[model samples]
Target: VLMVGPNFRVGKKIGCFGELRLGKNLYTNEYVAIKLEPMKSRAPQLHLEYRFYKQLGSGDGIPQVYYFGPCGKYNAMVLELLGPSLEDLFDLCDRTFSLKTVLMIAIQLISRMEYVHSKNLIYRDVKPENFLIGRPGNKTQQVIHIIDFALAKEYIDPETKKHIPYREHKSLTGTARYMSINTHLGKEQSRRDDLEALGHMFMYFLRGSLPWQGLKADTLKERYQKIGDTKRATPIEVLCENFPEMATYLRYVRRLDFFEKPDYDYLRKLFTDLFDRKGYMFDYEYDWIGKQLPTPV
Candidate 1:
């Protein structure tokens, strides 16, 4: 079980920051980041993720809640630190990702979202900044940690009163690029909407741009106003376009509102077939195919 940290001290190379309250360890002037949050009470999301990591570690698109505690002031949470944002990743790739690279990323991206949705929690913020690559040393041990769950919501819970904390409100609270129709309309968050946003992020990351990248409008809101024009494609569309091999699978994802359950075994086979020969191809630290790992691997 995870305990909230009352007073977590800064280690020799680590110090705390005020903005996000994350811990930073400057090793050789390079930061090893770990995100922390103040938990006001028992958080089922945190607990579920903690239990998840205990089974799969960092590869499951979930972060480790290393410490959880309630102090006199606020409950504390400590988790894996991932540096930079998905934007930084784009910068590193010179603003475009190779087809193979994008395909590999999709494997990890979709599977993780699938796992999260299976648990019935809506990860409202599905932007790249929330998808991170965290170091656990060595190519095989590297973990991708998803962060910033302040907007996550549970769609179903047996104990309604105990589980419900905030009253439901409909409003846009996440990044514009990844926003879906439901989120744009201020509909209460749900797993399906999350999958929708994931599709957009998948498109942006793999193609190095969103569908309407170059066109400009008078305002950011104006630019996104047309977002309703095309709200039908799943995140897997980019996968189909970039990696033709994924076409068959993408065909099944034709519906837009709710996702058709993906064939995990079939997907895994596809992941395996795509990069079977690249030694340790799916290893996080070694290759682009690193994204194609098994859901819990």
Candidate 2:
């Protein structure tokens, strides 16, 4: 009877590097994902990610953490179990997504990622693989929820409560396919970088694949540069192609310097208005599903 808490029952591994296992709350029968790391080495990202959740809180998008502490011989954290990632959903939708679905995501992602930035953190890696689809509040509700804080870090100075100064010549740290141009330039990642990658992902959904993808190189380092070069050489107008409106959003984010606070309100409005212009309703109907998400009562 492996258990993480009095009310939680540990089950078979659901996912993990630190052994992420499924946990069932016996009282409510609610599902949770528990990540456990060996106690011996004491070097683990679970604890740090646990701390990151504390900063994010219950945002209706990201996972709301339940328990964080020792579970038998290992450190354990129990959190709300979100459903499949955007990557999974993308494939399920035949590697392409509807404009309505993509724009709805833009609005929601801006809200969540903006909240993340408001908390002084930056989701350095913003690939589709890092964003899951499902709302923890209502299982039937479909929405994008960010996960994988293993690469997230603070952009604000705690002591001064100021944005950290920018620097260059840093190693690239995110997925090569969707990384910001500045990231390729070896510049420090900030809030803008997150939204920049979000732009690339939008194009990915529209086109099924990014231009930088499927490049061949002898070494990982060489491949990264090749991908970066392709991204830069491919103009925004060319990258967006049929979906040129997206270029405005991507270009806007790229203009922001490292320390400049992003205009979240404006950014969200950019998509919200675009959504309205497209005559789409906020019913949250996705490409993979025939039914609409329940309208708020």
Candidate 3:
């Protein structure tokens, strides 16, 4: 009864995004993930996200958008069906990620962010759930795919080739748990903000939780202030004690100027070096891939 566009028909519910449902192509019979949002809402973002997908094109990290338009009472978009998110994989692995797993993830996460940054846009929200692995049984299953551009925005004007001016006293936009301290401070976001958020995410995966994970405040404002305070107070050494490269990455991102371009390759190199130092092979055998992790000392 649910048909999306002309060629795709809606299938059963997908457990990921509550608004997301599974779809099937009539001709090829290929499965796809369809995100459907209410046509009339407080502040719709799916359409804007669709526009961003068009702007990004079919870059490797970017998911392929099959079709996008209105589906009667809903705004619908059919996307490439991907597999579990980093968050889900973390839970499936007993909520504990190995160093190799985290390193492999680090490289891909940066690559995704770098691609978006190069496109002059910033994924204002950076969290584990926003990035996913390829579908099961597929050769690209190990590959990471970036998604959820609801909060994405341009960090620079392409024609002007100039960065947006740094502004303060603004409202928070990114997810508070993994957002940069600058974001908590209400400063405008850019490449560094995304990278900094990823650093927070990496530390979270390695340590099981962040300093601001569990906190209770009267209001969101108070909670934001408390989280930002804790983040600003936690030194890199103490935050990433076991993961030195992560600490270095955090330091590098925190020190970036508002308009600075992040050294994505350098960041990736640090993790790759860590993987090598640990005597791990680049076999693409992820933690979820049944490969055993060496016992910790």
Candidate 4:
């Protein structure tokens, strides 16, 4: 049901907002993902997201935007068609990743976060569903592309270039399952929040389950508060249990101030050192390599 110029043929939907399509040029054929949003009473968030992508520049970790404009009553954008999301691949791999795969993913994700922070943006939504592997034949198969910037926001004022002040009782800003503790506390989020969320995600990747996985309560608010309480009560050592390396990482993140820029170098070193200490090579050959199967999500 999705189409662009006469030369493009739309295929299946990719995520909540887009579909995969093939664009045929006179000289060549290209595969691209098109995200189309109907602009009615909704905020023009996609337009803002488009600007972020343009600012990020082309890279192995960021999809390249090709075309963006109006289509009927919808605002549409055509982006590079990357490979499977970690969510899909996680399901295929029996809901978990090997330690090697997790390290590889962590390295790329942290590097991508550093790039985003450099642009003064905070990727508040840091979850497996937001990361996709690059497509084959692009020499980017080892690369992970971060997507879905609808929740992304500028943390630094463009004119002054200073960090934003913390606000109290702010509305929750990201997926509750992986949201940082500060987010649960209704505090304004910043770079540290992003990294803390990343730490939580890595826990999910390493164990395929979190301590708060099966919480229940009489009300949504009650449930969220309980989840938050459980998260706070559990120390990093217990949350990570046998994974001491992750325990150290989570403790380090928990110690950072809301507006503090994470020690990107030290974080990278932490994972790289883990890999080296374990006698694993940083070859980027993940567990899913050559074992990928096509699936629609």
Candidate 5:
């Protein structure tokens, strides 16, 4: 079982509100996660339900399930907590990543998703928040870890357990900035769709910007709705303007067909470049935007 984080003390898993008792692990003061019965497909907590289901499935991409037993007013699955979320990494990153760093992270995530497919599962969610960084003591040169699998499932018909015909979907779920057009179209997603989403993540990592950053919207759904209207062309255009070399790779990721095997070697090249950008993207204009920050008042 992993500790909460570097700052917090381990073996202190307790909640202030007596109504919420921490179960499992001797970790420091932290709230423990618990699972419950799967809700209806149309229920309000669809996201949580999908998360629990993914946790139930054994995939190397996620943290280990600590205990699968009854707890609270429900049957629960206690998951071993892991490091900072990918969102945290984004904030913590000094924005120093190169093509190599981007590809390194991308390849691991792609491999993780490919494994999910091998299990006949489709990981509907692939945004950064679902990933976690490496733990403090047990470390890796690669600091990132793909953490959540709540929205994954075998791509089988819920009724017949039969494979369904592939098609574009209209209804959407997921972080829009990283979602694929197929997902935007409410189509049944394939592994390629996941890869496309990663492409967006790669862009964000390199430039420290989201495709949806400046869009005006009062709600997530509205922003998502507007993002699809342009088929995310605006963001792709911005990415090309900022990182021209990436334009080619982004196109490749976008055009992938379902069941298409990604070029792992080429993928390696992208990460290698991003990681060692003093070479791959050395020509990038360093004096551009980030090089000059206004003095804070």
Candidate 6:
């Protein structure tokens, strides 16, 4: 879609980091989805995010970067258009995904996380909103892409090849509902932290509501505190009630050290084994395909 003017027509505001536009190169006439942010406040973070995307390369599950540079006072990057976010599909599926659908998502999500970790970075923010399906006519139509690197952090030291030390009282980051206990405790995050958040999200998809979701509290901080406290106090058995392996998975991730590298293969096999045991076919046709699934609380 080309606009009338020389510059691309800016479209909807996608996320906190940048706004999406139907972009085109005036000379090359190449169309792209441009994401740009004001340089004054977000440049450093945007630059960091750009580096993350660049580091990812033109992978199957990530957006391809076409152009990146300064556009006057704003920093801009042109990227490939992705399909609707998992959050959007979650709503379309009535908030809960079928067991088969969840397993399919789990494998793709874990594989992408492994790729990011291989690059020595940790994706601190992991949620349905951050993962998207590929758009129609794209080769990666069934693939799930991880987006929004604004909260990502470099865990491995470039010189020593060692993970950074754990620190306390750091500012809390990430979505409250999906945040790992370590993140909620204001500790330095690492690979385990990201997987823990993924574990929480997987649980959410299964049950549709977490136990500590709607606690009464006086302030935002208090509310988050209560939620975190409840998560820690509630036994994994209760959290993963009726699904014992889900409990096993959460417990395994919870026991990992602060900077520990996760056993990604083992984690993948856990879900794969579940699929085999259930005698389910591994297909990407999600629950929302034919039915209007109902959302849970």
Q: What lDDT would each prediction earn against the true structure?
A: 0.52, 0.82, 0.85, 0.81, 0.57, 0.79
Rate residue 6 of model 5 by lDDT. Answer: 28
Candidate 6 residue-wise lDDT at 146: 90
Candidate 1 residue-wise lDDT, 12-100, digit = tens: 22333112343432333322233333454445344454444444444465765565545334444555555444555666666776545
Candidate 5 local lDDT, 216-272, one digit each (tens) = 689866777777766556766666576655676678777877656667467546655
- Please give the TM-score that candidate 4 achieves against the real structure: 0.92
Instruction: List runs of model 5 lying over 4 Å from the truth.
Output: 1-23, 26-61, 94-100, 139-143, 156-163, 217-222, 235-238, 242-245, 273-297
User: How many clashing residue pairs appear in each of the predictions shown?
Assistant: 10, 0, 0, 0, 25, 1
By lDDT, the best candidate is 3
Order the numbered candidates by lDDT, best leading: 3, 2, 4, 6, 5, 1
Which of candidates 1 and 4 is the stronger one according to TM-score? 4
Better of 3 and 6 by lDDT: 3
Model 5 worst lDDT run, 10 consecutive residues: 288-297
lDDT (C-alpha) at residue 144 in model 3: 85
**lDDT of model 6, residue 217:** 90
TM-score of 3: 0.94
Question: Estimated TM-score per prediction?
Answer: 0.63, 0.92, 0.94, 0.92, 0.68, 0.89
lDDT of 2 at 48: 86
Model number with the top TM-score = 3
Query: What's the distance in Å from true for residue 89, model 2?
Result: 0.9
Better of 2 and 5 by TM-score: 2
| Tens-place lDDT digits, model 4, residues 1-297 | 445565444565655643334432222476677777776735667788798888777755888887777655667777777778888888888888999999988888889999998988898998888998877656776788998777888899887788888898987887778888988999888998898899999999888988887899998878888888989998888889878888888889888997788999999899999999899998877777777555332
**lDDT (C-alpha) at residue 161 in model 4:** 81
